[PDB]
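Posted in: Structural Biology > Protein-Ligand Complexes

Title: Requesting predicted complex, magnesium ion in pocket

I'd be grateful if someone could produce the 3D structure tokens for the following input. Sequence and ligand are given below.
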Amino acid sequence: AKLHDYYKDEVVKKLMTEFNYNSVMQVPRVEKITLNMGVGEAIADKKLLDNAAADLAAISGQKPLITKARKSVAGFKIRQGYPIGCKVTLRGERMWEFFERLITIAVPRIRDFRGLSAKSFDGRGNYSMGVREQIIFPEIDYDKVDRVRGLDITITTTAKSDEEGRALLAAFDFPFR
Amino acid sequence: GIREKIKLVSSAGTGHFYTTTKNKRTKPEKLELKKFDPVVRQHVIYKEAK
Amino acid sequence: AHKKAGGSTRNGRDSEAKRLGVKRFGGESVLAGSIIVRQRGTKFHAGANVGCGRDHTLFAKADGKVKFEVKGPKNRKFISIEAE
Amino acid sequence: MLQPKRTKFRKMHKGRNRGLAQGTDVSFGSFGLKAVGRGRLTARQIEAARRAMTRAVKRQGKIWIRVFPDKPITEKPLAVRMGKGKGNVEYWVALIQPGKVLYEMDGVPEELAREAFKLAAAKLPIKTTFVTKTVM
Amino acid sequence: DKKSARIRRATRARRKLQELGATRLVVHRTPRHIYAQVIAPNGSEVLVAASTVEKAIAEQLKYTGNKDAAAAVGKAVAERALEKGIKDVSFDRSGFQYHGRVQALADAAREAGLQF
RNA sequence: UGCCUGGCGGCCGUAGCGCGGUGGUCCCACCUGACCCCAUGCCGAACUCAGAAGUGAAACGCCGUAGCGCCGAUGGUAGUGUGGGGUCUCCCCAUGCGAGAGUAGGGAACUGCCAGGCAU
RNA sequence: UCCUCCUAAAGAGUAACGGAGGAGCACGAAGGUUGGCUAAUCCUGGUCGGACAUCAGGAGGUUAGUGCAAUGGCAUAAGCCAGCUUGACUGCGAGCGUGACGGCGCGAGCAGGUGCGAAAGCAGGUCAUAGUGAUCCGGUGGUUCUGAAUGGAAGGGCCAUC
RNA sequence: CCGACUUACCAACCCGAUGCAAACUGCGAAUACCGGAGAAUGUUAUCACGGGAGACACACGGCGGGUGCUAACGUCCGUC
Ligand SMILES: [Mg+2]
Ligand SMILES: [Mg+2]
Ligand SMILES: [Mg+2]
Ligand SMILES: [Mg+2]
Ligand SMILES: [Mg+2]
Ligand SMILES: [Mg+2]
Ligand SMILES: [Mg+2]
Ligand SMILES: [Mg+2]
Ligand SMILES: [Mg+2]
Ligand SMILES: [Mg+2]
Ligand SMILES: [Mg+2]
Ligand SMILES: [Mg+2]
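-- Reply #1 --
Done. Output follows.
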């Protein structure tokens, strides 16, 4: 919670002063971070998915969820019930630890960096993004992983709109344009 | 009509039995069930037979 | 030819009538075990002193007078019995 | 040739043409052709009337078809005996009750619309009449 | 949401008890308080009640919302039912699991004398 | 006795949606923490436990308001049982029953038991 | 031969070489019970990834789902998931439905012995309706029955089965 | 590096106005049927058991329909 404490001492009041919120809990707070990574090639090789699951358990210290097909789609040759994806949800101290790790170490390590887009808020303030490459996390040992495998990071926030969503992210010195 | 009639014989040795069906191409292992034995009036293990 | 031979239909099949419906109506005095309605699904639900069988046959669980009523948030049709 | 693009079933019972009509008012245009009698309008009959009626007004105004052939009619072939299943669908018809408005017209003078409906009604088996729109 | 899910959980036991025509001991649980009512078979009238929102019970309770609070309210509700003449009831957890205070309340009622 | 709140019902849209406002004494909810009792195909989100710092934001309750949902006559029409007629693919007459849709309107529920808080 | 719908005229039933579709199974879990859970579709945002894979939010509210046709039913789910388990129990059976009959179906409750649940309780197969074949003749196991002078035995009977 | 517009093209979903349905139903009769009570009328007209049958080729007419051509002194059902 080394950034949870950082949140509650300045950021709450910072949004309070500049948005005229009536109560302090009206200042939004990030509730969970969902770590999604859909392999899409388990049909070709089941065995690449367990290795992929191990990769995501290294980057974030949690066992990932193996998602099911949930519906048969012939355009991709999938039948329902087949393992197709990997998922983790992080809340509380583990969530904050992953958040600070991402922003401080990993986000600078992005190749061909230009920062992050500020328009991917789905209209309701919840951020979602995709990293192009996976070696950027120091948890995984370079040269011991089979292939590069990106993933999607979505920040689900209590914020009801993107404007106050941007205030929360910016008060964390999130990389906006 | 792939499923075939099989006989479940009590392990109590009283000669009573039940009849049912089993698919033998899959699940080829024996079927075991605690079922009521009308002769000794108790629940005993019934084993696959026939 | 002098006559033109016809074809053949392909729709000749039908199944036997199952004699479904309400056996005893409102106001009937029934014994225990009497069948009130024979159903496919639960068009009528079981109320007080009325039981529902495996094929959703509603039967009397007591002697008395049959009564139909509408209850519940969904306006479903229940069958109950006033013990008499 | 008016005809449903697809149907739930390809054959239908004969039925009965009873009762009065629904849609007895001029709801779209300003003038209308209203059926006085009852009977069946084939798609060919409806379409032949439409050709004469649209050609009468020199392709002016707007023309509305208010009826649709949705009832299929089967006919047994020549020299086949009774039975051996129902016949094959030959054509489609609409059932017409007294008072139903069959065609509507707008954008043209009343004296021209009256003449156009005369030529159009010459193609229909059922008695018709000329009606205009009214405020209810 | 939360309350709607709990009602859907409780509904099957509630309707089954109504069909059986059994006196039903309903338990309610909130983070600060726990509630218990003995309900007549017709379901509209209550017979006895005991809760931690009560002047008599609160002074003894150090902190309401505890298992000891559940034991106190269970003994209290059980003695009131016993002295009115009600001896056989059916438990209605009201969509809660029989693990903590619901189990604690039920366990408290057992020693004092209810039959369920 | 009046108001507020919680629980269990009656009832099953006149009762449900939407829009706006309003409440934290108690209550309710959010909420604090979690080796633990207990739990997550992972995750204290839910469930559970230990608590009461903050807050009524959401939710929930209450108040107001017809943009809907809903209820809804009178009259007429359709149909129709019995008997009788015609120009008989369909109608009509005597008599009885009499819709559906729509219209004028109504309408922001009413109510029972107990428990608590405030006031008298 | 059997099941579902319409014809079939608002109880049941109702014909045609009338209009349309299915069955001759499957499952020791896909059954019992306890606990838990709730879709289709669309919009917005998001690595490969696009109309359409996994993810977050929203709308929407069953427009999904049911092992297999159709109808009726299903949220207290009868739909989905997990733990434990064999009640897919044995002898009966008030009463009732449906058939000319053969027969078919439903069933509380009683007895014995069980499973799940803290308990109230639930369980005598499966959301229901097709998945089927009389009698004779034999085969197999058991049996407190019979046994052509008697004691056996063969054969027969009864029960369970092919 | 993510962009912002535009035109007389196509245009799904949705809205408003229209119809149609044996295998459509958020509505819904008249009758018919089942049951309870009451009077009057009816040579028990009702049920059960037993002795004896015949009959199981129907026809037309009305009304409600399928089939046929709302053709047939056609054909197949319901009801009188
Ligand atoms: Mg067919
Ligand atoms: Mg009227
Ligand atoms: Mg009306
Ligand atoms: Mg109306
Ligand atoms: Mg009928
Ligand atoms: Mg009828
Ligand atoms: Mg099943
Ligand atoms: Mg001898
Ligand atoms: Mg004969
Ligand atoms: Mg004959
Ligand atoms: Mg005849
Ligand atoms: Mg004849």
